[PDB]
Tab-separated table of C-alpha atoms in Angstrom:
chain	number	residue	atom	x	y	z
A	1	UNK	CA	-0.223	0.068	0.432
A	2	UNK	CA	1.206	3.641	-1.148
A	3	UNK	CA	0.470	5.715	2.300
A	4	UNK	CA	-0.230	9.761	2.040
A	5	UNK	CA	1.804	11.987	3.321
A	6	UNK	CA	-0.322	12.963	6.130
A	7	UNK	CA	-2.573	9.125	6.228
A	8	UNK	CA	1.064	8.420	7.405
A	9	UNK	CA	2.664	10.788	9.551
A	10	UNK	CA	-1.183	9.946	11.487
A	11	UNK	CA	-0.673	6.415	11.134
A	12	UNK	CA	2.431	6.976	13.213
A	13	UNK	CA	1.787	9.510	15.828
A	14	UNK	CA	-0.998	6.555	16.888
A	15	UNK	CA	1.791	4.030	17.206
A	16	UNK	CA	3.875	5.797	19.276
A	17	UNK	CA	6.927	6.918	16.898
A	18	UNK	CA	6.126	11.043	17.324
A	19	UNK	CA	9.180	12.355	19.095
A	20	UNK	CA	10.472	8.968	19.964
A	21	UNK	CA	13.931	8.651	21.567
A	22	UNK	CA	14.074	12.798	20.398
A	23	UNK	CA	13.053	11.911	16.968
A	24	UNK	CA	9.982	14.120	15.983
A	25	UNK	CA	7.511	12.817	13.642
A	26	UNK	CA	8.443	15.114	10.632
A	27	UNK	CA	11.993	12.915	10.816
A	28	UNK	CA	10.370	9.047	10.013
A	29	UNK	CA	8.091	10.812	7.742
A	30	UNK	CA	10.836	12.217	5.806
A	31	UNK	CA	12.621	8.979	5.450
A	32	UNK	CA	9.928	6.990	5.014
A	33	UNK	CA	9.426	9.562	1.755
A	34	UNK	CA	12.774	8.671	0.501
A	35	UNK	CA	13.877	4.870	1.867
A	36	UNK	CA	10.690	3.946	0.435
A	37	UNK	CA	8.453	6.127	-1.024
A	38	UNK	CA	5.401	6.078	1.597
A	39	UNK	CA	5.370	2.189	-0.319
A	40	UNK	CA	4.419	-0.582	1.821
A	41	UNK	CA	5.662	-3.292	-0.255
A	42	UNK	CA	9.013	-1.303	-1.235
A	43	UNK	CA	12.208	-3.896	-0.972
A	44	UNK	CA	15.603	-3.502	-2.357
A	45	UNK	CA	18.399	-5.992	-3.077
A	46	UNK	CA	21.834	-5.173	-1.912
A	47	UNK	CA	24.670	-6.121	-3.103
A	48	UNK	CA	26.180	-7.766	0.131
A	49	UNK	CA	22.466	-10.222	-0.656
A	50	UNK	CA	20.998	-9.053	2.036
A	51	UNK	CA	17.212	-6.908	1.458
A	52	UNK	CA	15.739	-3.960	2.122
A	53	UNK	CA	12.025	-4.176	3.211
A	54	UNK	CA	9.081	-2.260	4.006
A	55	UNK	CA	8.165	1.587	4.225
A	56	UNK	CA	11.217	2.510	6.550
A	57	UNK	CA	13.272	-0.319	4.588
A	58	UNK	CA	14.520	-2.561	7.082
A	59	UNK	CA	17.762	-5.204	6.531
A	60	UNK	CA	17.615	-9.120	6.682
A	61	UNK	CA	21.166	-9.155	8.097
A	62	UNK	CA	20.098	-7.855	11.330
A	63	UNK	CA	16.743	-7.126	12.092
A	64	UNK	CA	14.097	-9.527	10.410
A	65	UNK	CA	14.186	-13.285	8.174
A	66	UNK	CA	14.068	-13.731	4.877
A	67	UNK	CA	15.336	-17.193	4.727
A	68	UNK	CA	18.183	-16.374	1.644
A	69	UNK	CA	20.504	-14.321	3.547
A	70	UNK	CA	23.185	-16.158	5.602
A	71	UNK	CA	24.568	-15.662	8.607
A	72	UNK	CA	21.397	-13.093	9.616
A	73	UNK	CA	20.097	-12.172	12.492
A	74	UNK	CA	16.134	-11.388	13.021
A	75	UNK	CA	17.401	-8.544	16.116
A	76	UNK	CA	13.351	-8.032	15.502
A	77	UNK	CA	11.940	-11.618	15.371
A	78	UNK	CA	9.617	-11.373	12.750
A	79	UNK	CA	9.810	-12.384	8.860
A	80	UNK	CA	11.311	-9.924	6.834
A	81	UNK	CA	7.012	-10.021	4.506
A	82	UNK	CA	5.558	-8.924	7.887
A	83	UNK	CA	7.380	-5.522	7.316
A	84	UNK	CA	5.491	-4.927	3.741
A	85	UNK	CA	1.779	-5.150	4.733
A	86	UNK	CA	-0.370	-2.253	4.704
A	87	UNK	CA	-0.817	-2.175	8.560
A	88	UNK	CA	2.886	-0.577	9.716
A	89	UNK	CA	2.674	-2.546	13.133
A	90	UNK	CA	5.752	-4.645	13.020
A	91	UNK	CA	7.779	-1.810	10.988
A	92	UNK	CA	7.215	0.436	13.774
A	93	UNK	CA	7.982	-1.794	16.314
A	94	UNK	CA	11.041	-3.148	14.039
A	95	UNK	CA	12.174	0.895	13.679
A	96	UNK	CA	11.913	1.158	18.259
A	97	UNK	CA	14.148	-1.736	18.355
A	98	UNK	CA	17.195	-0.455	15.606
A	99	UNK	CA	16.889	3.561	16.502
A	100	UNK	CA	16.962	2.593	20.187
A	101	UNK	CA	19.993	0.235	19.691
A	102	UNK	CA	22.895	3.272	19.477
A	103	UNK	CA	23.727	4.788	16.323
A	104	UNK	CA	20.057	6.718	16.450
A	105	UNK	CA	18.357	7.568	12.854
A	106	UNK	CA	21.700	7.643	10.930
A	107	UNK	CA	20.761	3.740	11.444
A	108	UNK	CA	18.876	4.747	8.062
A	109	UNK	CA	21.519	6.355	4.973
A	110	UNK	CA	18.241	8.447	3.282
A	111	UNK	CA	18.291	9.933	6.657
A	112	UNK	CA	20.710	11.218	7.079
A	113	UNK	CA	21.948	12.413	3.911
A	114	UNK	CA	18.181	13.819	2.790
A	115	UNK	CA	16.458	14.124	5.899
A	116	UNK	CA	18.664	15.120	8.759
A	117	UNK	CA	19.254	19.535	9.286
A	118	UNK	CA	16.392	20.100	7.031
A	119	UNK	CA	13.292	21.114	7.902
A	120	UNK	CA	11.709	17.990	8.539
A	121	UNK	CA	8.281	19.301	9.637
A	122	UNK	CA	7.588	20.429	6.638
A	123	UNK	CA	6.477	16.492	6.044
A	124	UNK	CA	3.697	17.061	8.779
A	125	UNK	CA	2.873	20.834	7.480
A	126	UNK	CA	-1.137	20.954	7.189
A	127	UNK	CA	-2.228	17.310	8.547
A	128	UNK	CA	-4.966	16.747	11.000
A	129	UNK	CA	-3.031	15.064	14.288
C-alpha cells in the first residue's frame, strides 16, 4: 500500500513514533518518503546479498529473516515479509528497536543524507493530527 503524507503521519503518531527517542514525527515521515516512497511493498537487494523491506526499508542481515540471507540475525524476531503489510505495526515495532540501538536514525542512510538537519517539520505541514 502507498500512503499519503498525512495519512502516514497519523498512523505513525498513533503507533508512538511521534518524538520517540527524541526524533520528532517529521523525521520518520521524511525517512519514509526517501527510503520507500511511502510504499509498504518496497524491496531492494543489496550487494552483500541482504534485502531491505517496507516503508522504512529494514535490512535482513540484522533485523528480520528472509530465509535467504546467510549469517543473518533476526533481532526484531519476525519474517521480513511481515514488514510489507499495510498495517505498519511490525515496521514500527522494529524501527523502535533499531533507533534505540545506539546510532539513532543514522541507521537509515536516506535520513542521514536527505532528512538530517533540514526543515523536517515541513513533512507534517498541513495535516490533522
